[PDB]
Symmetry: D3
Subunit: 155 residues, 6 copies
């Protein structure tokens, strides 16, 4: 079926080895590039399967893990980005869509709007526009204004 | 140009086959690893191209698709993560940057702050800090306080 | 150690070439697929290293770069998604976890709740539920109600 | 089973393309190297299968085809060898063993002796040592001597 | 060092699996092609190493094993060749050179002459030209002639 | 065109590195296997090109180089073969065909007969059958017999 298949079989003892390991020392080009024309699949599909029946066994595991590091010998830092997503021609699809058991839980749409299915938290302020609707969040401004308006009506 | 090029040509009829398919049964190491030193590109770059001129044809497609599953025969669950992004040494760049037609739409910065370019939605509450600025969102606390303060001034 | 290792050595002059370049013209299947059973690692791990000691040198670089494009000759658009994350069986782990120097900065949990470590911004409204707690953000509704309630008490 | 499998499926029309194509421009190292420790198989095994039921269809085909050429732009020639076989430590096995339907037809042994199962031909002379046995081939010398010996006995 | 390295580690029990397995179903092109520009090495180098200290353990093994077979389902035969060696531009080097412990044992030169280091055998006749030198092998013709010449001198 | 292409570009200084390097430590299976269905090409085609215009520059080079070695740490020897060629079903084609500038110089046919285009040499005897034809080589037997026959006719 597949043009190239790379299989790492189960070793007797787990070890740190990979089926496929790629390294480039060329700062002028992507170490790896993929291009596909899928009608309804991912150009890259990554599946992580719990190696154990135990449902908490793989709690530190991930399908995709990214690290962003300084130059190994003597680097002063890095300003590289983690994930960069673009559509040079423009897309109508969701830029980031997160589902759990095939139900949408969080997404970022093509206009940069987000939708979250549950109560969330910002350890800081959220800057927003003034509400123009019932369930829009109220700014300090809107509160202060309805206050000052009611102070007046008591003279 | 490239060290290794893998090409799957257009079949007469589309089928489920991949240019490159990797599977590891070793729970001790990443099935695949990539490392690059790009000055201005992605270490991995994934491009998805609509296979059709029709702009809605690829609405279920994605550049990157991730699935997180239990052990196939008899697993009780999984606690594996979807995408994990870190910078062990620390980065000044945006951890997640989403653009559409080369304009920023949503990002998560290195301090975990987010910026969204459009009206968004949480089906639940948002916990925030008290506003200290005009367009900061107001907490139940801030509202209740300006209320209690105005009750007093009417004795 | 690794089953397959692909190395692109440092060229004398940087150029656009990749260690590994994959292209599929088959719209019926993922150009590439990866599956692993890691106990505590990423099924795919991508590391980007600053090629320079200079901490701002790689400011346009990324570990993962995604582009979503129309059909090259004559496409009218695309509705393809950037990143799609699912757990067909269901996971307890965070769907998106972003850390900087091994400290959590932003995440999206399995229920679609998000947590951000810093003040954030929406250029638009945020729709939320009515606050039921001190530091929950207040809706236009909650503000208007405590206003109308205080108007009444002044008759 | 295999660590890496590369499959080129049957195209609708045959064309000149290969499953795997390797080119090196480095004159200092082998474009490819293979090493194995087989107990009873070839380190490399090549099978050619007639693509047709017709028994004469593949008469120009070969399992292994070697070409030895001059430098493409302006070379004056080459002195490169076709096949070089050595045993740096020394082997007791046949250096070249040729069988047809699992019966030996021709071989070259570890001392450089050959054995051929059928009448053969040299378009030229064969230089040999004087016969010391019935079915050894006779040199001009041996013939001339038995002649001169018989001339004498007729005085 | 190498651009691509494929390693199959020692399994606990030997099995029939390969580091690299290639199959083409395209009758129009070589399943695999290699091209190099070595100054003093093989374009392909194959090393077989005895897996055992025992000097007779690998007596059925080979560095290169070739099989030439009919079409699997219903073929009537094949006329494919085993090894085909050419030099389209012409070479001064030996076409086949066989050494054991770095000493020449057998070769075929660029003119098709062979040299064998030991007594050899043809189960059949050898056709040769008439001897013109002492140690050239004698034809039936040369023998018969020196006979008829000596019959005459006895009248 | 090709499913997998591996290219090692010209380095500034030649070094010992390969485009593709394969090693198996599994004594139970071929380190590599190739299978093709070519109508008129080699299942594997190896081309060596002189890296220099100088026609003697590559005099130690080869298209295919084979080494047969003992186990590295403490082996007592090896009985492995260099090249093993078979046709399990049987072939009508030449088992080994050697050409120089597209003219046949030496071959071994499917019955194990050889043909050489030039004067050749065996440092030893050649055992052959008695001549039954003019240009067949004469055995010690045939010579001795025509001698004894002529002794008789002189009584």
């Amino acid at each position: 079926t597949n043009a190239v298949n790379i299989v790492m079989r189960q070793p007797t003892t787990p070890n740190f080895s990979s089926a496929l390991n790629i390294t480039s020392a060329n700062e002028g080009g992507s170490a790896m590039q993929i291009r596909g024309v899928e009608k309804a699949l991912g150009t890259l599909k990554i599946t992580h399967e719990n190696p154990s029946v135990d449902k908490e066994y793989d709690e530190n595991a991930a399908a995709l893990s990214i690290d962003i590091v300084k130059k190994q010998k003597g680097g002063k830092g890095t300003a590289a980005q983690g994930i960069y997503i673009n559509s040079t021609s423009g897309t109508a699809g969701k830029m980031l869509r997160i589902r759990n058991k095939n139900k949408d839980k969080f997404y970022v749409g093509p206009d940069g709007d987000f939708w979250s299915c549950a109560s969330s938290i910002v350890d800081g302020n959220l800057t927003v526009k003034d509400p123009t609707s019932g369930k829009h969040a109220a700014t300090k401004d809107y509160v202060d204004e309805k206050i000052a308006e009611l102070k007046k009506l008591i003279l």
